[PDB]
Amino acid sequence: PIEVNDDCMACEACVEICPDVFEMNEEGDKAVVINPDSDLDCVEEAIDSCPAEAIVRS
Numbered sequence: 001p002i003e004v005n006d007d008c009m010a011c012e013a014c015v016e017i018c019p020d021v022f023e024m025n026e027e028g029d030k031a032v033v034i035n036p037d038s039d040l041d042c043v044e045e046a047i048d049s050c051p052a053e054a055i056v057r058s
């Protein structure tokens with residue numbers, strides 16, 4: 001499933017783009033995945049919009 005790696009911080013950008021695919025952890029200390037098998041371009045915008053490009057279709 002999609003992964004935001006660990007190096008990621010918590011910009012919440014991907015969450016602000018697709019909070020249905022990527023949501024804040026328990027404390028927002030890391031971007032947690034919600035749709036480990038989405039099917040939208042949100043991943044494209046969630047990645048592009050992501051400067052840390054920690055999001056990958058691993």
Ligand code: F3S
Nearest residue numbers: 008011012014031050
């Ligand atoms: S920094 Fe982390 S919170 Fe989303 S926007 Fe890039 S995976």
